[PDB]
Design a protein around this ligand. Structure first.
Ligand SMILES: CC(C)(COP(=O)(O)OP(=O)(O)OC[C@H]1O[C@@H](n2cnc3c(N)ncnc32)[C@H](O)[C@@H]1OP(=O)(O)O)[C@@H](O)C(=O)NCCC(=O)NCCS
Ligand SMILES: O=C([O-])CC(=O)C(=O)O
Lengths: 434, 434
């Protein structure tokens, strides 16, 4: 009823049969060609893995189990007296395919409070890390260390049936999601607040509010932004580096802690997780010359004096998108309601007219619209979260929801080891002659 | 002449231009098809990536830059008073594609001795790790924490030219390889020798001997085993989960420390790097159930009786190999020479006689011959290394050579972010019906 685990248990047989029917109809059907260029080009355009939780709709954005972001904002439970989707509900949806009821989210909230405790060895390890060790490295190291708590790893050693893998994966995943805020908040407080303590979990708060409590914030609107932020960054298909890493490492039957920590190492990469900070450095830098008020000359110069120089207007491209990311619109509506008078937001609102001066003149992007990362930093900074090195941790905590919801399903559905074939250049040259 | 970095700087242009030409002419050549089954089946049989350092023919086994393991055992430098190939030479081959001279191996040994220091925070972290934190978890976490030393991470933030990525990757890779034995031997000692100290690096020893010193072994034969073991586990194409994880995380420009720690999380998965242990647990069990002094039939009975209950013979089969793994033969040859009368070896040897037979009469197997992991456990147990949870640490330290050699080349050649497209079951079903 409220126990997500039993609801999952009832869903899994239906999904297994649906896949079995489809593979029996179409297993041998060709869905794509592989070219030499796709192998050299990081598998671009190659349909390579199944990933159930989210799908990129080319005209409406990311859908979560079919629901668009605006749909999730309408339908998902909010905290009482609040406007923003609770990330608990998002997880419920990713796991079940169903929009939760208020009571389901409430149950899930209390489940994560109960499982939140950190083992002292992780606490010690985090307390001992130096300030020159990047927050994302701290996050990945601590999650790896948490695998001492893995129920899945122990049960596998004792020869548990394949038919039960999903159960222990579920337990580990809920445990991990529950702990993430505590870990994330210890990192923040140790780096940016002189090692002061995270305080206690409250058995009756939502995940996001426990999170902002432990970070040391007390600002309803900040907690509301966190709720929205954790919801919208949660999943973005399977092919992104963090999701795919988790998928790949998970397919070797590494437990959720190891799979997630590997993912965070992937997220830590500059071409994945650093877009947020780039933008905010640029915007801050833009109020060097501009001051508070300007024009498109101001803008198109760099726009052309940068895009035609070599670099970019940060936060106006993607790897497969094609329209104003709903993830941006999300934050914009947020900012228009709650901080209309903020200079930087105002600048960001100004940039949303100009840089879309159809930058297709150069023809180099195939995307003249702002992505998620264009809006995120200003909002964080407004609420007093200024330590940009930390922003990708927030992204990580969010992404946990997506990749763990899929990990449960990968094991439920008996997905095998990911093991493609590689070739050398020499090898490929000989293969093509024949 | 001897500076590997200068030799590599000279090779890179040649190969860039070679790939540029190949992709202009043959970039659109189709080298395979994707089916629905492949997407569900972990990309099995899918030509997915270019990986230059090694290629695994199903037929004759792994080749390292065109050389087989027997060709390498012969051609690669040995230590003075030594029979086994030094991993240093293996690494030089993978990086350069050339067999190194004695002098180049000597120079690389001194380079790795000089770069072997750990920062105090990494020492502290290892020494505080509890004894219930698995060695692979310690290894991954410690390597993540070393990324505070990353030259590449700091260069990238200050805006280095793409043309120079490979140089910082190379440096960071040389630093990590040098440090790994120190990390690995600290783990070994903290867990299995009540925290006794690892001692010093000798600037005139090879890498494998420094390592066995730090571990607390001073048996010349065990050093020779280590040299052989580190050489042969070094690389196995790009499609295995450890190399692939490293390739994937690297392609987001995560530094070598993060890419390697991610790979170890992959390696720690039961379907990737625990077959060694699994083999040894089965052999030890078998040795009780049929006595040490064993017949040829009672052994064939047990293997027959294993196959019926529906249970695997560990150490036989592979995801692509379809004949005897030359990394097995290597270990066999070493055993015949050094421990022919070892009860456990005899049994392993007997099983090579017996087991391939029976899997032929099955028709289920495809690969009825042993992999590397069938032979490794008993060689380690023989020399006094009986802590099975540690075995995969050795594999990891070996695999560093291969994945880092390739990581240098992936950056040198400008390999982009790995980003295949994922589909849901629902989405796939609709795509095929189109
Ligand atoms: C390595 C391995 C996982 C690859 O198998 P695979 O790619 O999934 O598939 P195969 O084509 O080998 O499978 C053919 C059939 O023979 C079986 N088979 C494979 N190796 C077998 C073995 N050593 N003993 C018994 N049966 C075996 C498979 O399970 C399969 O049976 P099924 O169709 O009834 O399910 C498999 O050979 C195995 O189980 N090996 C034992 C563990 C090991 O040694 N691992 C180290 C290498 S990674
Ligand atoms: O090749 C594989 O998939 C697993 C393996 O043997 C290795 O990585 O060496």
């Amino acid at each position: 009823s409220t126990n997500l685990k039993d609801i999952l248990a009832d869903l899994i047989p239906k999904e297994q049969a649906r896949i079995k029917t489809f593979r029996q109809q179409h297993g041998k059907t060709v869905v794509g060609q592989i070219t030499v260029d796709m192998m050299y080009g990081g598998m671009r355009g190659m349909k390579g893995l199944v990933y159930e939780t989210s799908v990129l709709d080319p005209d409406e954005g990311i859908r979560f189990r079919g629901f668009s972001i605006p749909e999730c904002q309408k339908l998902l439970p909010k905290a009482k007296g609040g406007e923003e989707p609770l990330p608990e509900g998002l997880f419920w949806l990713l796991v079940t395919g169903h929009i939760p009821t208020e009571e389901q989210v409430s149950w899930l909230s209390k489940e994560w409070a109960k499982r939140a405790a950190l083992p002292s060895h992780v606490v010690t390890m985090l307390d001992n890390f130096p300030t020159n060790l990047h927050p994302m490295s701290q996050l990945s190291a601590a999650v790896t260390a948490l695998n001492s708590e893995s129920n899945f790893a122990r049960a596998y050693a004792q020869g548990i049936s394949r038919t039960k893998y999903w159960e222990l994966i579920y337990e580990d995943s809920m445990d991990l999601i529950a702990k993430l805020p505590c870990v994330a908040a210890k990192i923040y407080r140790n780096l940016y607040r002189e090692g002061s303590g995270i305080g206690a979990i409250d058995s009756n708060l939502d995940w996001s509010h426990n999170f902002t409590n432990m970070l040391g914030y007390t600002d309803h609107q900040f907690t509301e932004l966190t709720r929205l932020y954790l919801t919208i960054h949660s999943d973005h298909e399977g092919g992104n580096v963090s999701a795919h890493t988790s998928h790949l490492v998970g397919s070797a039957l590494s437990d959720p802690y190891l799979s997630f920590a590997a993912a965070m190492n992937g997220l830590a990469g500059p071409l994945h997780g650093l877009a947020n900070q780039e933008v905010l450095v640029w915007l801050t830098q833009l109020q060097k010359e501009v001051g508070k008020d300007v024009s498109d000359e101001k803008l198109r110069d760099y726009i052309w004096n940068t895009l035609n120089s070599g670099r970019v207007v940060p936060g106006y491209g993607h790897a497969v998108l094609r329209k104003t990311d709903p993830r941006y619109t999300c934050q914009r509506e947020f900012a228009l309601k709650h901080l209309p008078n903020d200079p930087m937001f105002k600048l960001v609102a100004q940039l949303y007219k100009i840089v879309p001066n159809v930058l297709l003149e150069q023809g180099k992007a195939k995307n003249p619209w702002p992505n998620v990362d264009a809006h995120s930093g200003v909002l964080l900074q407004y609420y007093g979260m200024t330590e940009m090195n930390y922003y990708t941790v927030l992204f990580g905590v969010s992404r946990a929801l997506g990749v763990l919801a899929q990990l449960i399903w990968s094991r439920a559905l008996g997905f095998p080891l990911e093991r493609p074939k590689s070739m050398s250049t020499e090898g490929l040259m000989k293969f093509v002659d024949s």
